[PDB]
Amino acid sequence: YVDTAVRHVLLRQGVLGIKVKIMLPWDPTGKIGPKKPLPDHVSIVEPKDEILPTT
Amino acid sequence: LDVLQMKEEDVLKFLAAGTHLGGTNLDFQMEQYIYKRKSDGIYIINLKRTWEKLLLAARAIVAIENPADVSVISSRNTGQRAVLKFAAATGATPIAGRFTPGTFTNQIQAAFREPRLLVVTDPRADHQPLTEASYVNLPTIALCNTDSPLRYVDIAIPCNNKGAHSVGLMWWMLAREVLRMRGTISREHPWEVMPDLYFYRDPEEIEKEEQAAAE
Amino acid sequence: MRAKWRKKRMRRLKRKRRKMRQRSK
Amino acid sequence: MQNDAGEFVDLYVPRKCSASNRIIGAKDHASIQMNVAEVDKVTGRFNGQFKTYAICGAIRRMGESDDSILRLAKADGIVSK
Amino acid sequence: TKKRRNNGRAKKGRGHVQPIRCTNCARCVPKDKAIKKFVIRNIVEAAAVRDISEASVFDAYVLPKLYVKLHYCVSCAIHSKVVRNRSREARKDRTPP
Amino acid sequence: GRVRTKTVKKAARVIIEKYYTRLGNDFHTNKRVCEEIAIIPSKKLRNKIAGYVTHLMKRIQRGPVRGISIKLQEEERERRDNYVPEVSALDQEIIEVDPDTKEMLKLLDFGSLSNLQVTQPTVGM
Amino acid sequence: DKEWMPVTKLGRLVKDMKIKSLEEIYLFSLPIKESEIIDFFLGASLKDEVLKIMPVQKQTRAGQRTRFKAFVAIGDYNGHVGLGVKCSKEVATAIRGAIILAKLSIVPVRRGYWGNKIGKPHTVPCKVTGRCGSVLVRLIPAPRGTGIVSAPVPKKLLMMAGIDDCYTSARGCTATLGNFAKATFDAISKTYSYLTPDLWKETVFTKSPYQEFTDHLVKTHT
Amino acid sequence: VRMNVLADALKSINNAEKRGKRQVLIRPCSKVIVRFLTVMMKHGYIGEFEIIDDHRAGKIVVNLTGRLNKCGVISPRFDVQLKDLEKWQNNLLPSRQFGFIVLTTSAGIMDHEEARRKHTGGKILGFFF
RNA sequence: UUUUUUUUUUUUUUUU
RNA sequence: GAACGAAAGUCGGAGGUUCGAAGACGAUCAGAUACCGUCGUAGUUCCGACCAUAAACGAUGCCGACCGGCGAUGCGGCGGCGUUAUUCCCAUGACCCGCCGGGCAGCUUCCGGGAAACCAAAGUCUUUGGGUUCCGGGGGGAGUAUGGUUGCAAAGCUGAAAC
Ligand SMILES: [Mg+2]
Ligand SMILES: [Mg+2]
Ligand SMILES: [Mg+2]
Ligand SMILES: [Mg+2]
Ligand SMILES: [Mg+2]
Ligand SMILES: [Mg+2]
Ligand SMILES: [Mg+2]
Ligand SMILES: [Mg+2]
Ligand SMILES: [Mg+2]
Ligand SMILES: [Mg+2]
Ligand SMILES: [Mg+2]
Ligand SMILES: [Mg+2]
Ligand SMILES: [Mg+2]
Ligand SMILES: [Mg+2]
Ligand SMILES: [Zn+2]
């Protein structure tokens, strides 16, 4: 889920260390984000129906 | 006035409920409503000025046009029964149970209201909505007791609100007066529902006991 | 040091200096 | 407040409170413009016209509002004799 | 600052109250400032009542009690676990159940 | 240590509140009903959810819960709200209470219908 | 570019454009909540200055936690000014927050004459006072074209408040702008609260914006 | 003990105005107080009033409009020669639009505005606005 | 029941 | 200018239970001359005189007025076919209910204040003036020196500068 990026920058002051980490969004289909959901983030389905009376 | 004046059926129902007696302590701004000390150290509220504040409170409730702007609160389980039926009785917005402080002030929460008038049951039980009134510019009609303070109260109706019967009779008669001032039923006709809905049902056990004896 | 005992030491010094003055009037 | 030109100088005229004749401030959020409706004669039906009573902040906080609304309605005659 | 409105004790009209000795460290303390209690005790251990109830001569009608006005000063009563501290709004309290 | 997590109790209350109907008092059936009506990423989470769902079912089948009520409890509480007999909004239409309210109804213009009689000593409180 | 995103029913009145000016809101002292309401009523209120940004320190278990406290004073030059104090852990965050809080706390300023009525007022209506902490700021009317003789911070604040001429008299820790600017703000806020013997006329009581446009409110809720 | 009863009257007036009550009781009475309230009434800052005539010393009850910000007494009753009013003007009056000063002239208890026309001057009782 | 002391100075603050 | 003014202290007379500065030992500690324990001096007591100081504290000069409420409690006064003790009216007795005056106080409050803690006064103050006495002007040096004055003495009163 977390894409680590660690780079160096050389300047006249010396060096600068940068760390960038980006949590990818959960997209269930496609190349955008990962396809497994979070184990904490649990999705349910909305309610089913209504009518059910006898005949 | 001469047509909104009291009738004997009203005072018969008042004396049947027991609203004439009150507590043992006075607020100093509650002197003008109440009448006389009693033998059992009990202060008797009049009914003459009691009807007058109910009349003015009814006029103020009919004054706001959209009845959904009427917001009605009761915290204690006496008036928790009455408020829910009183709200659908005219148009009002019921809020009982826990008041959820920050009802009127912050707007990040979806449970947010912008009323133009508030009616409560007990100020000492509703110390929080009366405090929240002063930020959002809304008046107050309060069913005040004999020993209840009057901070942030605009129209105070003198009554007893310990017992559930007097509470329910007041909510019944207030709805009864507001709907007539709207013009649903004329004055010379009884109101079509009976105040037990507005009173309060406790542990059903005794309710279904009455049902089981009346089978 | 308390102000109490500071006053006591200055008081004792005052008595010593008074004895020195009375020893050489 | 008028100048020598007779122009109405000020931006807005604040509500002088009907209780105790004191100015409702620009941020006195305890103040309220109470409205009470007119009633017909013996017919007893609603009139679409209403009367306006202003209550300011410190009066509401102290409790002169309960006395004040009845004493303002009584001089107007809308409550009793 | 004032930590207390009453300055601890209860002298307001007076100019001077008698001192009374404490029991533990025997310091004299003005008798409203002192921590006052009153021990009503069965003179026997309540577990040891039954041993004397066995071999008692009479029909258990003699039940002696020992009454002591017990009188502490604050500097040792707190060490002796009576007057344990509280909060700002909890200092406004009265009699414990 | 069954102190179960906020997300577990949250999803369990959502499950029972949406679908009270399919869930029964049998744990192994309710476990498989959870996979039909929800998406649970893991089997330990399935078991924890289903266990607390059955423990909630043994309360809801027993009585109403302060957490959430089903539609049946809603209809029964609405019935208990609007049950109206014709008994005691009014008594027998003379109620006797007080000589002071007798003086009051002498003052206010009414008929002075019938009796009102107590006399008391002065031991209030 | 982004949409206004209404809530709280006064903004729905604003989007229906049914309240003309901001004076209608100050007639009834309705509580203002969203910030761009005054942007819709005033498109030329961008005139502001950051008064001071100062750090405050919280001594926590490892080291001192720093967070910056930004003061922003905004104002239209017609007699509307706002003052905003906002503390946050970032400069740009605290500046944006202090701008939004000044937008919320904008209030009008009464402006009177020195003593001759001739026209287009230039000064405070009387000797008003304002107090915040131990700072007393006293505003005294001044003759025409005098300028404002004061400290630089309330000179900026009264330069925004449409005052051209004023005398000031401070007392207290004037070194602390956190109380001093709020004292000057309370002083210029009390100007409509202070009575005057040319404002004795009984009120007219025009209708509420709510009761005036109930139909818009009903159709927007529904 | 009891001295300068004008101050005792006007501090009661001030406390009643700050509280917001309707009418005040003042236990002493002076011709000074009566003419002072006459000036205040004629300029409109108070309402109608009424003097309960005790045989010993009466009691004044004043209906209040609600406009009175502040009334008060200058303590030692200073002399004021004319062309020395403007000190007291800048020092006491809140603005150049309102505010009044009650001088004591030889021709009666006068006002700050009537005094400059009548060209008298005299002693200051107090001020109100 | 004990239970004392422990160099000296090193530490500065932003634009939107 | 004057009268009282706790404890301690000083000077006579009487006695001397307890406590107990000083002092003595025994223990504890590295050291105790300190806390702990044993003994025990002056004083603690009373009668005469002096000394005039204290966290002498509500750390809030005195008089006067105005500005919210509530239940108390102490002392008078008043009202109340409520109750109860005499013997049998009668009174004051004892509770209960309520009012008035001023006293010690308390809970509450956005009365208004203040830097706040908090206060019905520490409020009625930049809208600053009811009358009046004593006072403070960065900390130290210092309530020290030095003069005068009181005191038997201890010391008290007045009281500065260099730096
Ligand atoms: Mg301390
Ligand atoms: Mg003392
Ligand atoms: Mg400085
Ligand atoms: Mg060493
Ligand atoms: Mg002595
Ligand atoms: Mg000696
Ligand atoms: Mg000798
Ligand atoms: Mg001898
Ligand atoms: Mg001994
Ligand atoms: Mg002294
Ligand atoms: Mg004094
Ligand atoms: Mg003194
Ligand atoms: Mg008595
Ligand atoms: Mg007697
Ligand atoms: Zn002890």
Where does residue G138 rank: exposed (0-12), middle (13-18), buried (19+ CB within 10 A)? middle
CB–CB of D1 and G208 under 8 A? no
The whole-angstrom separation of Cα G114 and Cα G109 is: 16
The gap between E13 CA and J132 C1' (Å) is 28
Whether residues H15 and H57 share a domain: the answer is yes
The whole-angstrom separation of Cα B117 and Cα B125 is: 18
The whole-angstrom separation of Cα H59 and Cα H26 is: 5
Whether residues H125 and H74 share a domain: the answer is yes
Closest CA to H103 of H85, H82, H124, H84: H124
The whole-angstrom separation of Cα H55 and Cα D33 is: 48
b or e along B71-96 (b: 16 or more beta carbons within 10 Å of the residue's beta carbon)?
bbbbbbebbbbbbbbbbebbebebbb
DSSP E56: -
Whether residues H57 and H78 share a domain: the answer is no
CATH number of H62's domain = 3.30.1370.30
Tokens of B41: 């150290």
Q: Chains D, F in contact: 3+ Cβ pairs under 8 A?
A: no
Whether residues H2 and H45 share a domain: the answer is yes
What is the domain extent for residue H34?
1-68
Task: Read off φ and ψ for residue E36, nearest 5 degrees.
Answer: -110, 135
Radius of gyration of chain F (CA): 29
CB–CB of D59 and H20 under 8 A? yes
Which residues on chain B are in Cβ contact (under 8 Å) with G29?
Answer: 137
Which of H35, H68, H101 is the last residue in one of the domains?
H68
Whether residues H74 and H60 share a domain: the answer is no
Task: Read off φ and ψ for residue F113, nearest 5 degrees.
Answer: -65, -65
Neighbouring chains to A with at least 3 Cβ pairs closer than 8 Å? F
Task: Read off φ and ψ for residue G196, nearest 5 degrees.
Answer: -155, 140
Tokens of D20: 């105790």
Contacts 24+ apart (CB under 8 A), F99-107: F100/B36, F100/B38, F100/B39, F100/B44, F101/B15, F101/B20, F101/B44, F103/B36, F104/B20, F104/B35, F104/B36, F104/B44, F104/B46, F104/B47, F105/B11, F107/B48
The gap between E37 CA and J75 C1' (Å) is 31
Name the E strands within E1-97: 19-21, 28-30, 35-42, 65-72
Residue E90: partners with Cβ closer than 8 Å, 6 or more residues away: none
Radius of gyration of chain G (CA): 20
The gap between C23 CA and J22 C1' (Å) is 28
Where does residue F68 rank: exposed (0-12), middle (13-18), buried (19+ CB within 10 A)? middle
Tell me how many helices (H) and strands (E) chain E has.
2, 4
Whether residues H5 and H55 share a domain: the answer is yes
Closest CA to G128 of G173, G205, G185, G172: G185
What is the structure's resolution, reported in angstroms to one decimal? 3.4
Tokens of F32: 């498989």
Q: Can you say how many angstroms the Cα of residue E59 is from the centroid of all Cα atoms in its chain? A: 34
Give the CA-trace dihedral at G53, G58, G64, G70, to 10 degrees.
-10
Strand pairing of H71-73 and H59-63? unpaired
Whether residues H2 and H63 share a domain: the answer is yes
The whole-angstrom separation of Cα G172 and Cα G155 is: 17
Which of H47, H68, H89 is the last residue in one of the domains?
H68
Judge whether G56 and G158 are in contact, CB under 8 Å.
no
| G192 and chain D in contact, CB less than 8 A | yes
CA distances from G152 to B146, G80, G181, H121 (A): 57, 19, 11, 42
G63, closest nucleotide (Cα–C1')? I11
Whether residues H33 and H61 share a domain: the answer is yes
Judge whether B100 and G194 are in contact, CB under 8 Å.
no
CATH number of H101's domain = 3.30.1490.10
Judge whether F19 and A49 are in contact, CB under 8 Å.
no
Residue in B3, B52, B155 closest to D80 by CB: B52
Whether residues H64 and H121 share a domain: the answer is no
The whole-angstrom separation of Cα G49 and Cα G74 is: 6
The whole-angstrom separation of Cα G85 and Cα G68 is: 11
Whether residues H64 and H31 share a domain: the answer is yes
Strand pairing of B117-120 and B141-144? parallel
Secondary structure string (H, E, C) spanning H15-70 = HHHHHCCCEEEECCCCHHHHHHHHHHHHCCCCCCEEEECCCCCCEEEEECCCCCCC
Closest CA to B141 of D59, G211, D66, D31: D66
Give the CA-trace dihedral at H13, H14, H15, H16, to 10 degrees.
50
The whole-angstrom separation of Cα B19 and Cα B9 is: 14
The whole-angstrom separation of Cα G218 and Cα H89 is: 57
The whole-angstrom separation of Cα E29 and Cα E21 is: 6
Where does residue G151 rank: exposed (0-12), middle (13-18), buried (19+ CB within 10 A)? middle
Residue in G115, G141, G200 closest to H67 by CB: G200
| Residue numbers preceding breaks in chain B (C to N > 2.5 A) | none
Amino acid in position D36: V
With H, G, I as helix, E, B as strand and everything else as coil, classify residue E89. Answer: coil
The whole-angstrom separation of Cα B169 and Cα B165 is: 6
Which residues on chain H are in Cβ contact (under 8 Å) with D21?
Answer: 65-67
Interface of F with B (CB under 8 A): 80-91, 93, 95, 97-98, 100-101, 103-105, 107-108, 110-111, 113, 118-122, 124-125
Q: What is the DSSP string of B13-33?
A: HHHHHT-S---S---GGGTTT
Handedness of CA G30, G33, G34, G36 (dihedral sign): positive
Closest CA to B81 of B96, B68, B91, B67: B96
Where does residue D77 rank: exposed (0-12), middle (13-18), buried (19+ CB within 10 A)? exposed
Tokens of F66: 């302060």
Judge whether H48 and H22 are in contact, CB under 8 Å.
no
| D16 and chain G in contact, CB less than 8 A | yes
Where does residue A12 rank: exposed (0-12), middle (13-18), buried (19+ CB within 10 A)? exposed
Distance from CA of G11 to the nearest CA of B (A): 12
Whether residues H1 and H38 share a domain: the answer is yes
Tokens of E78: 């707190």
The gap between H106 CA and I1 C1' (Å) is 93
Judge whether G28 and D33 are in contact, CB under 8 Å.
yes
DSSP G30: P
Name the E strands within D11-80: 32-39, 46-55
Whether residues H111 and H128 share a domain: the answer is yes
Query: Which method was it determined by?
Result: cryo-EM
Judge whether H18 and H47 are in contact, CB under 8 Å.
no
DSSP G207: P
- Residue whose entry in the numeric block shows the structure tokens 């946050």: G88
- What is the spatial order of strands in the sheet that G148-149 belongs to? G128-132, G135-140, G166-171, G148-149
Judge whether F104 and B20 are in contact, CB under 8 Å.
yes
Which of H68, H86, H103 is the last residue in one of the domains?
H68
b or e along H9-46 (b: 16 or more beta carbons within 10 Å of the residue's beta carbon)?
bbebbbebbeebeeebebeebeebbebbbebbbeeebb
Number of domain units in chain H: 2
CB–CB of A37 and F41 under 8 A? yes
